[PDB]
Design a binder for these strands. Structure first.
Ligand SMILES: [Zn+2]
Lengths: 186, 98
DNA sequence: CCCCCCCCCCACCCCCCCCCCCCCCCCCCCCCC
DNA sequence: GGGGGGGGGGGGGGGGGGGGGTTTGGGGGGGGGG
């Protein structure tokens, strides 16, 4: 049931790391979309047998020598070149969520967190949105770890041309609509 | 009784590999089919029509070396190896045997 | 119109790299067939 | 007279070691008040 409960940001303590929590707050900032490599594809110049590296961290080191049996058995130390055509990219975006101004205890600074969102779920958020977000609360390499929330699901807090006839048919609509402008004002 | 210590291996164009199916039998299978020479083309293009097949075959056989260096290796093993001599003389012996 | 204000601008581990050593290959020379 | 084997040189690989990776004051420009 814990994933159902909307936590304020300052309730997200270290013991939650690894859990599919749900957080509540205001988005104070949103990144522009950028691509990130899921799998790098390298061509091999001297044999044409491509090879692949999967990336699973904020950084990586690129391959140099052709590890494929096509080169390795021929002991042919061919050179590898990255191809953006064949590499699988995924859409990446970061958003900073802050607790609601009402939730801040008296005298504390409002606490905030990085949300990372990937794939088709990108650009579901915008600054000034007040929102509930489900995600995996995770560490990142900085013993103190950096931390972020991998977003998974989002809940934002927030025919006619026939229907206009309902007011037109009732008549004197200019006078009435003008009288409908701020009726509490004398 | 003893745990291993590593030593770097090395590979070079052995006459056995040169006599594998993708070796000279590949040349016999494919050279007369793929090289074509004609008065309809200039000398540079005709030379290229030879060189392209031998280069592709050389790379597919032994991709490590450059084509000229491969050719020097081939000329020198041709100068030396007895089984390769028996194969080459067997080719011209087969042509005699026709 | 003149003076004061205020605003701006500026001063420990991991990778790359290099050095050292050992082995293997290739050529040359000599002997054997 | 040519091919094999022995011996010496030269090059390449692999390992090991090492080093690097914001406040305060002052002048001048620009704008506002007496
Ligand atoms: Zn390759």
């Amino acid at each position: 049931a814990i994933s159902s409960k909307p936590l304020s940001v300052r309730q997200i303590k270290g013991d939650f790391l690894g859990q599919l929590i749900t957080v509540r707050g205001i988005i104070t900032r949103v990144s522009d979309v950028k691509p990130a490599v899921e799998v790098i594809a390298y061509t091999c110049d001297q044999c044409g047998y491509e090879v692949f590296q999967e990336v699973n961290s904020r950084t990586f080191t690129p391959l140099s020598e052709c590890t494929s049996e096509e080169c390795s058995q021929n002991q042919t130390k061919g050179q590898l070149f990255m191809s953006t055509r064949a590499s699988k990219f995924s859409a990446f975006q970061e958003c900073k969520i802050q607790e609601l101004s009402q939730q801040v205890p008296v005298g504390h600074i409002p606490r905030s967190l990085n949300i990372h969102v990937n794939g088709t779920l990108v650009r579901s958020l915008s600054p000034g949105d007040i929102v509930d977000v489900t995600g995996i609360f995770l560490p990142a390499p900085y013993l103190l770890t950096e931390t972020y929330l991998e977003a998974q699901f989002v809940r934002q807090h927030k025919d006619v041309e026939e229907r206009v006839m309902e007011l037109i048919t009732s008549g004197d609509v200019y006078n009435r609509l003008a009288k409908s402008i701020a009726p509490e004002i004398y | 009784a003893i745990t291993a210590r590593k030593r770097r291996p090395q590979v070079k164009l052995t006459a056995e590999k040169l006599l594998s199916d993708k070796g000279l039998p590949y040349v016999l299978k494919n050279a007369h089919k793929r090289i074509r020479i004609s008065s309809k083309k200039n000398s540079y293009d005709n030379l290229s029509n030879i060189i392209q097949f031998y280069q592709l075959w050389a790379h597919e056989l032994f991709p490590k070396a450059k084509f000229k260096d491969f050719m020097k290796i081939c000329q020198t093993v041709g100068k030396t190896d007895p089984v390769l001599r028996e194969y080459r003389v067997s080719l011209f012996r087969d042509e005699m045997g026709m």
